[PDB]
Structures are given as structure tokens and as C-alpha cells.
Amino acid sequence: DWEIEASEVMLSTRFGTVYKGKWHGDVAVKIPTPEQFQAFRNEVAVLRKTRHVNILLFMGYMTKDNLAIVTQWCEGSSLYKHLHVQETKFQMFQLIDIARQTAQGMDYLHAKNIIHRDMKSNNIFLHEGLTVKIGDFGLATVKSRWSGSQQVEQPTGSVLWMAPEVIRMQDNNPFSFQSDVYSYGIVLYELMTGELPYSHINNRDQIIFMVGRGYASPDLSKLYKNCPKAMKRLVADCVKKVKEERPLFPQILSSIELLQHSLPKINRSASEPSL
Amino acid sequence: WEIEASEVMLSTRITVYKGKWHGDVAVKILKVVDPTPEQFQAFRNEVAVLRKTRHVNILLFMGYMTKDNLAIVTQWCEGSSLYKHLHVQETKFQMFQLIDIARQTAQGMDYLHAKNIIHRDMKSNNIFLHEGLTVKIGDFGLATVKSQQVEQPTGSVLWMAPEVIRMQDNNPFSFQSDVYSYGIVLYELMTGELPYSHINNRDQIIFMVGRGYASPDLSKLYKNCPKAMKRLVADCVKKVKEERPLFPQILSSIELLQHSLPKINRSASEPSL
Amino acid sequence: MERASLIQKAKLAEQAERYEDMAAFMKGAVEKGEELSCEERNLLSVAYKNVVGGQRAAWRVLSSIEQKSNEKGPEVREYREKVETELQGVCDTVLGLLDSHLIKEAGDAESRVFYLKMKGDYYRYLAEVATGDDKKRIIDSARSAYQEAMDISKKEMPPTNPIRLGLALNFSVFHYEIANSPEEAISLAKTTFDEAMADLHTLSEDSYKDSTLIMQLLRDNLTLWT
Amino acid sequence: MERASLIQKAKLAEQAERYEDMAAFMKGAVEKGEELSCEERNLLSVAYKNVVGGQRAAWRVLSSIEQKSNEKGPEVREYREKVETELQGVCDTVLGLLDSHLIKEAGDAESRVFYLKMKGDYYRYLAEVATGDDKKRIIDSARSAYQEAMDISKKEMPPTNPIRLGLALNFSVFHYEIANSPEEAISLAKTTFDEAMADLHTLSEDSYKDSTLIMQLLRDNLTLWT
Amino acid sequence: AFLTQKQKVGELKDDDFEKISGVVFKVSHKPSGLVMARKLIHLEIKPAIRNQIIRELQVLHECNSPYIVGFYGAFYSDGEISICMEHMDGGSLDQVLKKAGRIPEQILGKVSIAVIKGLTYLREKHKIMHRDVKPSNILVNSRGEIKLCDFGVSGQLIDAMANAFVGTRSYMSPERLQGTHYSVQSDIWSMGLSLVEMAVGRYPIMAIFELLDYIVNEPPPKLPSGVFSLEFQDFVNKCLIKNPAERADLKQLMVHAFIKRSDAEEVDFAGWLCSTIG
Amino acid sequence: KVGELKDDDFEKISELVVFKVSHKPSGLVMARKLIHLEIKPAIRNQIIRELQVLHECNSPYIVGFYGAFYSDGEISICMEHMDGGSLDQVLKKAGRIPEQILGKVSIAVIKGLTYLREKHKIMHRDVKPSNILVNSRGEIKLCDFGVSGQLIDAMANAFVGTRSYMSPERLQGTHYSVQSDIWSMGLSLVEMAVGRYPIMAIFELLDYIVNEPPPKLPSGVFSLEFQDFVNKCLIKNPAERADLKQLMVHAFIKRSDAEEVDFAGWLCSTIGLNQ
Numbered sequence A: 001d002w003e004i005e006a007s008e009v010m011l012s013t014r015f016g017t018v019y020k021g022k023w024h025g026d027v028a029v030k031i032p033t034p035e036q037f038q039a040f041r042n043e044v045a046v047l048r049k050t051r052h053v054n055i056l057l058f059m060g061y062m063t064k065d066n067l068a069i070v071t072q073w074c075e076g077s078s079l080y081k082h083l084h085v086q087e088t089k090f091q092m093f094q095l096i097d098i099a100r101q102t103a104q105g106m107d108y109l110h111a112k113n114i115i116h117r118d119m120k121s122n123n124i125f126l127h128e129g130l131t132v133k134i135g136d137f138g139l140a141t142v143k144s145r146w147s148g149s150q151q152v153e154q155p156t157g158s159v160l161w162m163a164p165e166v167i168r169m170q171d172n173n174p175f176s177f178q179s180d181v182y183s184y185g186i187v188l189y190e191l192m193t194g195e196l197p198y199s200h201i202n203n204r205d206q207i208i209f210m211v212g213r214g215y216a217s218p219d220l221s222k223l224y225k226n227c228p229k230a231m232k233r234l235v236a237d238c239v240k241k242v243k244e245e246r247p248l249f250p251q252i253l254s255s256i257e258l259l260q261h262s263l264p265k266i267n268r269s270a271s272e273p274s275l
Numbered sequence B: 001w002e003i004e005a006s007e008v009m010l011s012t013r014i015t016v017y018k019g020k021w022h023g024d025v026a027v028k029i030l031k032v033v034d035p036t037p038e039q040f041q042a043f044r045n046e047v048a049v050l051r052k053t054r055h056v057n058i059l060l061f062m063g064y065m066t067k068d069n070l071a072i073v074t075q076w077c078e079g080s081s082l083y084k085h086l087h088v089q090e091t092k093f094q095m096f097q098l099i100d101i102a103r104q105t106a107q108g109m110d111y112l113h114a115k116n117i118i119h120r121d122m123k124s125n126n127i128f129l130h131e132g133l134t135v136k137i138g139d140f141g142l143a144t145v146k147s148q149q150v151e152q153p154t155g156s157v158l159w160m161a162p163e164v165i166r167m168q169d170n171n172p173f174s175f176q177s178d179v180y181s182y183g184i185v186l187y188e189l190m191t192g193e194l195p196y197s198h199i200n201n202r203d204q205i206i207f208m209v210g211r212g213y214a215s216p217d218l219s220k221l222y223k224n225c226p227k228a229m230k231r232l233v234a235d236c237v238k239k240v241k242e243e244r245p246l247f248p249q250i251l252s253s254i255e256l257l258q259h260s261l262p263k264i265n266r267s268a269s270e271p272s273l
Numbered sequence C, D: 001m002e003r004a005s006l007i008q009k010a011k012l013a014e015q016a017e018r019y020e021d022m023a024a025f026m027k028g029a030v031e032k033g034e035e036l037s038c039e040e041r042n043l044l045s046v047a048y049k050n051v052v053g054g055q056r057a058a059w060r061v062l063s064s065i066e067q068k069s070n071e072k073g074p075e076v077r078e079y080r081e082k083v084e085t086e087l088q089g090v091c092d093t094v095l096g097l098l099d100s101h102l103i104k105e106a107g108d109a110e111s112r113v114f115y116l117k118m119k120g121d122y123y124r125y126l127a128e129v130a131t132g133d134d135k136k137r138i139i140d141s142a143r144s145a146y147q148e149a150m151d152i153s154k155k156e157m158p159p160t161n162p163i164r165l166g167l168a169l170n171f172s173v174f175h176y177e178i179a180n181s182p183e184e185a186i187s188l189a190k191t192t193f194d195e196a197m198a199d200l201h202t203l204s205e206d207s208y209k210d211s212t213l214i215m216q217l218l219r220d221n222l223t224l225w226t
Numbered sequence E: 001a002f003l004t005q006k007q008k009v010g011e012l013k014d015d016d017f018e019k020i021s022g023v024v025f026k027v028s029h030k031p032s033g034l035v036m037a038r039k040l041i042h043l044e045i046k047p048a049i050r051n052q053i054i055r056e057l058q059v060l061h062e063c064n065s066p067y068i069v070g071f072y073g074a075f076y077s078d079g080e081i082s083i084c085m086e087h088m089d090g091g092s093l094d095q096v097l098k099k100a101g102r103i104p105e106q107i108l109g110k111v112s113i114a115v116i117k118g119l120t121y122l123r124e125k126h127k128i129m130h131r132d133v134k135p136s137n138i139l140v141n142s143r144g145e146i147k148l149c150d151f152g153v154s155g156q157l158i159d160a161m162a163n164a165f166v167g168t169r170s171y172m173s174p175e176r177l178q179g180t181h182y183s184v185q186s187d188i189w190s191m192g193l194s195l196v197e198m199a200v201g202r203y204p205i206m207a208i209f210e211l212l213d214y215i216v217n218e219p220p221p222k223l224p225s226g227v228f229s230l231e232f233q234d235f236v237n238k239c240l241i242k243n244p245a246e247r248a249d250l251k252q253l254m255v256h257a258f259i260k261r262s263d264a265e266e267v268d269f270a271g272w273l274c275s276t277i278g
Numbered sequence F: 001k002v003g004e005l006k007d008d009d010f011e012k013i014s015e016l017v018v019f020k021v022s023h024k025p026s027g028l029v030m031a032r033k034l035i036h037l038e039i040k041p042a043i044r045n046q047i048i049r050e051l052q053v054l055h056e057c058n059s060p061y062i063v064g065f066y067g068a069f070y071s072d073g074e075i076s077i078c079m080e081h082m083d084g085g086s087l088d089q090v091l092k093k094a095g096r097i098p099e100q101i102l103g104k105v106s107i108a109v110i111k112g113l114t115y116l117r118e119k120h121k122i123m124h125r126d127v128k129p130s131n132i133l134v135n136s137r138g139e140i141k142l143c144d145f146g147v148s149g150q151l152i153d154a155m156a157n158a159f160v161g162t163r164s165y166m167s168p169e170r171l172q173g174t175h176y177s178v179q180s181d182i183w184s185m186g187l188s189l190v191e192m193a194v195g196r197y198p199i200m201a202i203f204e205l206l207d208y209i210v211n212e213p214p215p216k217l218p219s220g221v222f223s224l225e226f227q228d229f230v231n232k233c234l235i236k237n238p239a240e241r242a243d244l245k246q247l248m249v250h251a252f253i254k255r256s257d258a259e260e261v262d263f264a265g266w267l268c269s270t271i272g273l274n275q
């Protein structure tokens, strides 16, 4: 929970490669100017209010010597690693279960008034191969009545995954529910197709201008025909260029659970079992 | 952690309600028509201790219910308790599963004692095997934080300490009572039957463990795994308080026996691809 | 060689997964000419269904390779008809044993149901590889044999009989795959499931468990095609 | 049949799990007489390994049944001797192919050690199913095979290659199982593990992973024997 | 007349009873217009053991006596066993104790005669022991009948239920508490404590373990001599011999002069109970 | 003379992410450019195979290539050590630049670019002020050009890159050629000529590039030949933009060729070193 830990943890070497620790079991660690102190305070504050299974568990923060956080050591790899490095074949029910779990977790986050702003396939950790984890709240925020007064800062990430109004910066705060909705939709896209969007362009600011003016959308033709049409139209209307047309999370979860109840099953036709 | 009543609905009954709130949950609800203030006190102690619990090996908690009937909403475990598997389902676990279960519950209780909390009533009904691989510790209705006359124990007399059977000290609960209950648990899973099954009188057991005649018999434990478990289960069930060891030592013994334990019955060679 | 000795050798090689050997031993044991008991019928059905399933998976793999190659050498197709001739020979010997003594010595109506169910199934496995006029004559034979199978099963078995449910699901798969009657398969499966749900209260706990292991597959298949 | 056609048929078979079929196919391909490539050598090793491992598992089950029955019918002994003759025949066939042309045409020391490993391993299996003075002559042949292979490997070839690592592992396995030499087996296993751990720092990532996949097994069986 | 109403009541399932009022509640069969009860005991045991339990408790149909309560049946439903039970309008004697406070001596003699007759019936027909004689197992009606209930008919059910309720009051015999041989003398002992406890209203001497220690290592309490008759004190002290060898058995209790005097007395228990209710 | 390259042969000396190392079988100072990348191992093997082509590029005005490898999950390209450094720190420590040095580096960039076109038919695509390198010997050489198309497809996701110099005809997906590179060359020249951008977010920058004409230098600070040179280099339409044959015969480039400037003396006076 709160409080300062001590030297009981282990140190390996004085974006690196490994930061794994050992304290009441295996754990995971991250990592003198005040700009780090502000973001550290915000991430400590936002992980104080995270109590759900789909999100990484936070238990401690330590301040002396270097600045660091500790969370549990997940077993497995990121969804980016599973999809673009290993290319492990996931069956249909597993994929839609992953989508349901991620949507449920982000619905809990938005219901408890948390805006993550930076959800990524590199950030979604598939623990053990069954349950997905949501983490890396270093730039997550809590909106309020005075949140529009401050001017939001630059993301400096990968340009594939922010909303057109985010990269247009036409207002003080482009970040809202619908930005994370569009991010979850493009997560659904890369989960379905299996590749990153706009593969036919090898330039970044091309993508920036090209979806900045609304001149392109990710191709829905690459979606498979065996996919249900309901989540196809869900992906279609959740990536709309208009902010108002993007639906909120509760009806997304309702549609996903209706699709779950109306799912088909594994392939072949099931003959008589050898009893 | 305040929650409104309407967004949480009951679906099926298990006391315990299988509810839905951002997914399936477990609802421990107190049905008292005329709530009395010491129930409010115990509810407040439960909430206060459960707010401070953050670990992977424990049963995770989200929020509480105040209006209408009093309730506690926690996560829904998949599977069943260890009592059903060991005494009702009789599932043939293998020995590395038993060692991993012991290590996991040892880690959970070691962290829980590092928070300086006494659970006071742990047994096989309060350990949940999530997905058949991970353990979870719950039912903190009788736990307390160290900081008056103790309230009288109410659970089954098998797992509780001989000293609290002897009710001689004002507050007999300590680390070593948890250690001895843990020792009863390790007596339980590694043979699969409850202690003193040949005796079917409750107060006979109470008196015999109070006077010191009673002792769990290690005869029915198998000899296939080496004698490390034998000395461990002998040491952790000892009657005197001071000779029962502390949890870093039992952890260290667990991984020391895990470093020298093979999973192969024969000689394997070139794996055919 | 003795009939009971062949039976215990078959049980031994069932425990040692040597299914073609234990199939040969019960082939001799049924060639002795005596009627079969329930567990012997179970052993026969399990052995031949495992053998046909193994060569059927091989045939499916070879057929997939051939159809992706038909978008280089005739090795793939000629090996496919080699495995197909192996399967045709195996099914021919099994059906020969059936029409030689089994279907005529099945004095018990339960044994007649079992034998007609298996023999319609073996016609179905032949129709899985047939192409021409062989297809239509084999599917007509399976149609007939299944029809009197359900007739006698409905006239003298309880509705929640597991073999009755199993022949129902084999017949629904028959319509989906080879008879091309999806609405009739769905209708048969839903009527059998719902009337089984009406009659589920008449069984003991183990018979109900054996029925659950069939209704779960039936529900899965109905959600699969509907 | 054409040689590369037989290789492609063997690839079709290993993705169609027809192990006796691939064995006969490359038996024809090796009776062609030409020297083989590394991938063909790997395919033959794993395929006859699958075959003789299946017969070995069947023989172990039958030996357990016979030793439980020898505390009432010679059927168990007859079936055990029948599958023993089957294993002796297939091992003699593999050894005959080897001493016919493979060990003579093995020019490079890699395939030399590989074929020595093969014929020593089939000596090991023949000795596992053998008993008597025949068994001691067979283990003498297996000895000579293993020391020749490891002499060649140690003279010309670095420790971290998987064929040498598996040869040393099979050396210790043969000592512990047949010669009853646990001290020698443990000594060779730990010495090979230390040499491999010393020499692994000059390898690529995939080669390092392929080595550690069986360094895990070496650490495991050293743990098992200690 | 209890058997002829049983013949009018056939198979009994979960749905056709309605809740009215271990735990004990009350049902009533709507067509027959009869008032029954049911006993709900929760266990966590294997289904084969459950079938053993139900086959062991089917024997209770043969237990028919004017001093033993009636048996209806039992069935397993909703993860629990429900034992169909004849309703007793007057309730157990602890509620009567809380209603009144003290019991007249003639009532004590009548209920002592009843429990002695019940123990002799159980030993002469089923040759078993009650093992839980206590005021909660004594039931009375407005008709004036006194019958026993809640005895160990199934030893496997004893093994099952032995891991359950704590026990605030103890009515235990020291000889089986020590672990020695037990007989009807244990039931006579527990009858002695139960009778004196419901005669004076409380235990004259706290945690359960020290009560067990007091039962083991201290002499049992005795009534003052100047309150009641000396024959009553002699009777209860004959009931209260610690060593069961000299503790009197059923025949010496039956031939005791107190029992003969109380049987010679004519007491209107039904009228007194109706006056207590109103 | 340098053989196969391994990580044990390199010892860290300093940082230029670019490091400075040395090769202990050779003893020469070595430039160590490291970049993080995540793809399947077969793809990076293909990348290594197609960057083996880097051996044959040899010119006085291109930085020499020595080898490459893949180690510790990190793709490693090696660079010849370039002691004078890039022009970014040169303009940082010098503020502005003389026009004569601009003519010299114009000579350098056109000669290197024509060499690349006539010997490999491969353009640069990243002519940046940071990518132009100078030394104490006065050699101005190119680097980091677009040789391996799969490598552009690899890192195309992230560049940090708050400022861009990419041509308008490359925005709308139209045909792209060397006109883009010489346009970016004109931007680089005017940028270090004034020392700033003499006119803030990335989308507004690219919006100004696409929809507004490029600015014009004041006449009183530069010669008319330089102004006509940059005006021919800043033509928006690539067809009207003058190609290489026009820029090799311009009056300004002939005046720069006829000039004799001690640029090596100027740079060694700027860095303040005694060789």
C-alpha cells in the first residue's frame, strides 16, 4: 500500500534490460530534478486507487537513493511481444476473451475516474497466457473541474495510437473517454488482423498528417470473414473521426457479453466421444 | 471505497452472493435485521484491516456496502477451497503441487505477518486454489492488528492453539498460534485426512489437547520425499511457544528442499522433434 | 485361440494403446461366432472408431495438402488414394464382419441398435471418401440403416439412453456433412435435447453424468451451427 | 522412386504422423546409396527414434505386466517376446543399413559421430531387450561405438555442439541403466556440463538456446542421481 | 393414532412444504393439514458417505414408542440433509425453564420416570445409548407426553457432526472424556447433571476448558440438605457417582423408592402447562 | 584489415544513442551507434544480409563502414569515428556560419549525393543538420542514408523527432524523388544560415509546410547568388524545382568552387584543439 520499503529488495546492476527484484517473492521495479518528482507523485497517487484483478497490483514506493516503484513480477510477455515477435496463433475465443478483459478493466478505470491516456499493446501484459494485465500509469491522470484549466503536455510516444483530435491539439485538453475508446478500438484492430495499422507507409509524420486531417482510417478489409459481424461494426463505429459517435464503455461491454453468449466454439464438428 | 447499492446486484446464492460489479464478484453479506454496535465495530475492524492488504497470495478486496444489509464485496475466486479438493473431491495431487501450495501459503502468511497481523482462524476452508495453481487467503472476519480481554474463539477446535484451548493468558494469540495452525495445515494436505479421525468426541479432543496428551501422528505420512518434510512438520507443530520457528526460516527450508528435488523418474535422452 | 484370452489380450493392448493388434484379436474373437456383451461391444466400437479416426485425420491432412496444391508431381494425390484404399479396406472388413454374423445374430434389441448405429457410422466414414455413384448408394444405405436405427431405438429405449443420444448426434453430423440437411440436423438435435431434458429425472446419478457428457456436446454443436 | 520425391514424401508423412511409412520411405531412400544431408539425417534420427521408442514403451509396459504376473498363462510372455522380436527386427534393420553403407560413406566427422551415436543407441536398445552373454557382447559393441564417437568429437570438435552433448548424455544414461555405473555417469555428465558452460560464450543466440535446452536435462538428471 | 396419520402422508419432497417458523424450523403439509418440523444439519462430506448416512438413518422408522418421538423421514436437498420431524407444540424444556424459572418436584419425578423408561426401551429394543441426554433433547406437549430425541442412531453421522458446534454448556461423563469404556452409566451421569441443572436453574460453580477440568478433577456439586427431601438428595447422589462401577444402573434406578413414589403420584402436567400458557 | 566484429572487442570510451569505443584487435578509435529494435529474428537476419551491401560504398565524402552484428537483443551498426562531430554542436558553439563554409558543404552534399545516385541508385531520405558530419581533416561526409527498406519499415514507428524537414510532395503519397532531398537540403542550409527557425507543435509545423510558402531571407545579409540558390532550392513544386544538373552549373556553386577557404583552420579554431 503506502509507506517506504528498505534494502530488503535485491539490486542487480548499478530503459535498461532487466529490473526484476526479490521481495516477498519476485517483483518488478521501475528505475534529482523536480519534474521527475511531480510525475512520481502522480503515479503513486493513481496506483493508490487501483484495486482490480485486470490491473497490476501496487504495494510499495521507495524514495531514498534512486527513485523507484515496485509491483509484482508478471509471468509471460506483452501482447506486442506475442503478436509481432512470437506470432503465436491464438484461437478466436481467446482473442475475444482478451478483448472482454481489457474492456472491462478500462471500464472500471473510467468508472472510478481514471484517464490512462497511453494504453498500448506494449503495455498490455498477458500474465501466464490467460489473464491480461494493464499497467504503466506514469502519465495517467484524474480529471476534475479544474483539469481543463491546465494545458496538457506532449505525449512523445508512438504516433500510431492517439486520436486525430489529440494530434491536432485544437483545444486545451483533447484527452477524454473517447480518446481511450479509439485506442481500445485500434487495439481491437491489431488484435484481429495481427499487424500494426498503416503497414503500407514507412514514414511517421506521413501518418501524423494523414490521419490528422482525417484523410485515412485503418483498413477494415483485412478483418477475417470468420469473425462475427457485431464486433466488426463495434470496431467500425468506435474508431469514428467524430468524438460524439464513439460509444462509451458500458454498452461496449454489453455488446461484448452478448457476443460471448452468442459465440460459436472450436473447429471441427464433434463426433461421438470414446466412452 | 464507498459503493452505492444499485450498481451491485445479486445473481445466485452460495451469506455468500455471486454478484456482478464490473464483472463477477464475491459478496459476503451480513443479514441482521437489528444491527447491534459491536457488529459495527467488527465490521470496521474487518474493513480497516482489509484496506491494508495488498498481495498476490491473498484474496483481493475492492469495496464495502453500508446501506441496507451489511455486506463485503471481494473478488470471485475460480475453483473451490482446499477442503473440497482434499476431503470431498479427493483429487490426486502430486507431491510438487503440495510443495508449491505450501510455499505459496507460507509466502502469503509471511507477508501478512510482516504487516504484523494475526489471522487467528486459518484452516482449509479459508484457502482457495485459484485456477488450480495459485492460492488465495480470505475470511478475515476474526483477524486483528497488534497494538483487553480476548473474545472467545468460535471456529473448529482442530486448528487452534493448545494455549488458546487452555485459555490461560489474557490474549494468547501470537505468531506461534498461526505457526501451529499452519503446521496442522501441512499435516492436512500431505496425507489427506483430518487429525484424530479415530476419535469422534469434540470435548474429548479439547481436553486431551489442553492437558498435552494429544499429538498429531506423523506415521501416516509417506516416505517417498526425503526426511526434510519430516523434521519440518515435527518442528512446526511443537507445543512450546518458543521452539516453534519463524516464517523466514520455514521459507528458507522450503527453497532449500526445492533446490535438490527432481521431477523425472527415468533417464531421458534425445527429444524427437 | 480362446475367446476370453483374446478378450484379455484386447484389454491389455487397450491399456498399451496397440489398437490395431487388439482390434485384430477381437476380430478373431468375434469371428469365433458368439454374440457380444456390452463391454465387448464397447471395446469393438472404441477400437474401430480410433482406427478410423487416425486414418481419417491422415486423410484430412492429405486432402488439405492436395486442395492447396490444386490452386508439381502426383505423389501427394497418389499417397492420398493409398491411405484411402487402406481406409476402404479396413471399413470393408468391418462391414463384412457386421453383415456376416453381427447384424443377424443381434437378437437383443439393444445389440441391434448398437450394430445398426455402428454400421450406419461406417457407411458415413465410407461416404467421407466416396466421390461418384458410390457416394449416392452409400449415403442411401446409411440413410436407411440410420432410419430403422432411430425407429427401433425410439420404440424400445428410454429417451435419455446415452447410445440413443450418441446416434442422434452422429445423425445430425451426418446431415450437416454429407446429407446436406442443416435444418433437419438442427431440428433433430433440438427435439432430442429438449425431450432428453424432459426425461432427465428418470436416471441415477452416474447415468445422468453419462447424459451430461452428451448434452454438453449437443449444446456446443447447436451453438456452433446455429 | 526419386530421392527428393521420397524426402518430400517423408516431410508429408512427418506432418501426417505415419512413422512406419516414413521409415520404409527413407529405407528405400537410403538404399539408393547417396550420401545424405544434415536435415535428412535429423529427420531419420527422430523418425526411427519415434518408432523404436513406441516399441520400447510397449515393451516396458509388458515387462511390468510380466514381472507382476511372475509373483496362470504364458500369453503375457508370448506377447512380450513377440514385440521383443519386432524390436529386434527393426533394430537389426537399422543397424544393417548403417553397417551396409552409412558408416562407410560417412566422410565428415559430424556424420561419423552421428552414425556412431545411432548404431550405439540401437545397440543400447537391443541390450535393453536382451539378457545373457548376447547382452554382454552387445554392450561391448555399444561401448566401442560410444568411445569411438566421443574420441572423434573430443579430438576435432568443440563441446557445445548438440550432437556431442547428446552423445555424452546418452553415454551416462547407458552407464546408469545397463552397466550400473552411477559414479562414472555422474562424473561424465558434470564434466561435460562444466566444459559446455565454459565454451558456450562463443556461440550465437539460437545455438546457445539449443544447447541449454539439453543442459537443462543434464542438470536435471545430475540432480536426479545426486 | 400416530401411525394411521403417517399412512395418509406419502412421499415428501422439498417443494410441497412451506417455511413457517444445525437449525430447527416448522412446516405443515397443505392437503393433510398436519403440522410437522424439519431438522437441517449442514455437512461437507463425500456423496458415498452421504448415501451411507441416509441408509443408516433409514433405521429410525422402526423406533416407535410412547417415550420416543416419532420419525417421518429424511431427504438430501440444496446441499444439506433435511430430517422430516413431527412437531412438538410445547417445545423443549430450556424454553420452559426461561418461561418459568423452576420446576416442581413431582414434574421432576414424572420426567425422570419417562427418561428411565425411554432408556430402558432403547436398551431392550435397539441396545444402543442416547449419548446426548440434555434438556434440549426433552420434549413435552399439551397432551402431557414426554419423549426423548436426538440420539446417536448413526455412528458415521456422529463422526460427521463431531466437527461442528463449540459447546458452551457441557453434559459430559468423565469416563468417556478420559477415553475409557462407556455404557449407560454415562447417560445416567449426564441425566443427573441435566436434572439438577434444570431443577436449580444454573450451574453453581467461565470458559469451556476449565469446566472440563472441573468435571475431571473436582467432586460434583450437591444440593443443600434443608431444602428438599433427603430421599431426593439420596436419589440424585446415587445418580451422581463418579466411578461408574458403583454408579447404579437402570434396574436400581427403576426400583428406587423415589421413582415408585413419583409413579404413585397423580400429576396433571397438561393442566399445569395450559395454565402456564394461559 | 578489420575482421569479424564482436561485442567483447569493443570497450566504451565516451558518448556522442551514439558511443565512442575502440577495437582491441586493431586499436583504432571506433564510433558506436546503437539502436533498439524488436522484430522476429529472421527479419533482422535479412536486415544484416542486406546491410552487407554497405561494404562496397567507398567515397571521400561518405563515412566509412567496417562491420555490424546483433547482440543482447540489440541490433548493432558500426561507424567510422568522426572526431569533428556533426554540425549541430558546431552551430551550438558557433551561433552562425559564414556563407563560404555553406558553399563548401553544398559542394560536399551535391558530390556525395551524385556519387550515391550514380553508384547505387539510392537516395538519402534523411538529409538533416544532425546527419552532416565534419572532421579535423575537413572532410564533410554523409551518413545514415536509406539503404535497407525493411530497416525503415522496422524503426518507422518512433523517431522522437519534434522537428521535421520532409518535403510537401512526400505528404500526399505522391511520387517522390531526389527533389525531396534537395528541398530538405535547402531547409538545412537556411536553418544553420540563420541559426534558428526565423518565423510550435509538430502538426502546426507540418501544416505550415504543406499550406504556406517558404520564407525568404532578407537581401542585406546574404549575396544575391546565395538568395537565388536557395530560392531555386525552395521551389514548392518538384517539377519547377531545379534538379542536380541545374544546381551543378549555378553561379553561386561556381563561385563557391572558385573560392579557397581555410575551413579546416576555422573548425579547429572553433573546437580549440592541437590535433
Ligand SMILES: CNS(=O)(=O)Nc1nccc(Cc2c(C)c3ccc(Oc4ncccc4F)cc3oc2=O)c1F
Residues within 6 Å of the ligand: B200, B201, B202, E039, E060, E069, E070, E071, E072, E083, E130, E131, E132, E148, E149, E150, E151, E152, E153, E154, E155, E157, E158, E159, E161, E162
Ligand atoms: C457430545 N456429543 S458426541 O460427541 O457424543 N457425538 C454425538 N452424540 C450423539 C449423537 C450424535 C449425532 C446425531 C444427531 C445429531 C441426530 C439428530 C436428530 C436425529 O433425528 C431423530 N432423533 C431422534 C428421534 C427421531 C429422529 F428422527 C438423529 C440424529 O442422529 C445422530 O446420530 C453425535 F454426533
Ligand SMILES: CNS(=O)(=O)Nc1nccc(Cc2c(C)c3ccc(Oc4ncccc4F)cc3oc2=O)c1F
Residues within 6 Å of the ligand: A202, A203, A204, F054, F063, F064, F065, F066, F077, F078, F079, F124, F125, F126, F142, F143, F144, F145, F146, F147, F148, F149, F151, F152, F155, F156, F166
Ligand atoms: C522521414 N524519413 S523516413 O520516415 O523514411 N525514415 C528513414 N528514412 C531513411 C532511412 C532511415 C533509416 C536508416 C538508418 C538510420 C541507418 C543508419 C546507419 C546505416 O549504416 C551506415 N549508414 C551510412 C554510412 C555508413 C553506415 F554504416 C544505415 C542506415 O540505413 C537507414 O536506412 C529512416 F528511418
